[PDB]
Amino acid sequence: METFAFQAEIAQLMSLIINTFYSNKEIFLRELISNSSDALDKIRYESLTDPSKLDSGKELHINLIPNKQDRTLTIVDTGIGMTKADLINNLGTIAKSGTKAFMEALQAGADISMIGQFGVGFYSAYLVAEKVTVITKHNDDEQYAWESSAGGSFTVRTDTGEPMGRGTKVILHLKEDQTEYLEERRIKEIVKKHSQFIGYPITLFVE
Ligand SMILES: O=C(N[C@@H]1c2ccccc2-c2c(-c3nc4cc(F)ccc4[nH]3)cccc21)c1ccnc2[nH]ccc12
């Protein structure tokens, strides 16, 4: 396990998301499903030129997995996934410029719900989660685990868990007062409101 420091801008954004009073927290799911859909578009598009891109799995889908025992909501996709270089470097560049643009817009009067327009909608996970674990597998790299509870750092290690084939798992370790996002009726309601026309099958698992 390797530990990395967030740049000051992204650390400030994570603190704003955690500390700001903002009741419309449900938008985190729209943001994560949108990132999953974008990752699925990306591998689908690459496969149009190189069909072997799907040797790591033909199914293009999104699964929503609640676990009341662990207090986790997991979003699974069979999209493009992220390499080690994506997790540490490439996405750090995106997070930096996206945060700057979002913070400027927020000071001007934009709302937290508009976070996705800045390419940093992933960080809306911290509206409901005290810790986020990302398990990911990209065709060009090994399976990795990225994780952060904010506090200014994140970790990256090769993941020894169940081999995914290709894609991303976003594990949301929910805050104690955010357990409504583990309830079937609540997740169904949110998906219907914000994500009813996503071009991939979204399966809401139950317990
Ligand atoms: O949401 C994704 N990736 C997000 C993302 C987005 C924007 C900025 C940063 C990050 C990010 C990061 C990340 N943020 C960083 C911020 C830094 F300061 C330095 C390195 C960083 N790495 C780590 C894991 C996952 C993601 C993502 C990508 C592909 N397939 C996916 N399926 C579901 C989500 C998902």
Side-chain angles (χ1 to χ4, degrees), residues 12-141:
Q12 190 180 16
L13 179 56
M14 292 176 81
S15 286
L16 180 147
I17 295 163
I18 291 156
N19 308 341
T20 308
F21 180 83
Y22 183 77
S23 298
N24 183 41
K25 295 175 179 277
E26 74 184 33
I27 65 104
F28 80 93
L29 188 67
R30 175 187 66 201
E31 297 305 329
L32 294 173
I33 290 174
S34 177
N35 281 16
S36 282
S37 179
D38 290 354
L40 284 160
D41 287 347
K42 193 163 177 183
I43 192 69
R44 184 187 51 190
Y45 207 83
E46 289 193 353
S47 80
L48 264 20
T49 56
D50 182 1
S52 79
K53 289 281 183 155
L54 299 175
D55 286 353
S56 55
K58 298 262 225 293
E59 281 72 38
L60 299 183
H61 59 70
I62 302 168
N63 295 331
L64 307 182
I65 313 175
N67 193 289
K68 285 179 166 170
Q69 181 114 98
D70 300 338
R71 206 211 288 157
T72 57
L73 177 57
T74 304
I75 302 90
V76 183
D77 67 71
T78 56
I80 194 149
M82 291 162 269
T83 63
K84 192 182 178 188
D86 287 330
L87 296 166
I88 296 163
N89 309 112
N90 312 150
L91 294 160
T93 306
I94 297 310
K96 187 181 176 159
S97 56
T99 294
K100 284 172 102 287
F102 183 46
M103 295 298 269
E104 280 179 2
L106 279 173
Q107 279 181 104
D111 192 68
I112 281 170
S113 72
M114 307 175 193
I115 190 170
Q117 285 181 59
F118 306 91
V120 288
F122 168 72
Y123 283 96
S124 68
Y126 290 95
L127 287 171
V128 302
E130 61 188 13
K131 182 172 73 182
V132 175
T133 311
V134 171
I135 314 295
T136 192
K137 173 67 175 79
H138 180 110
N139 280 342
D140 302 342
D141 212 341

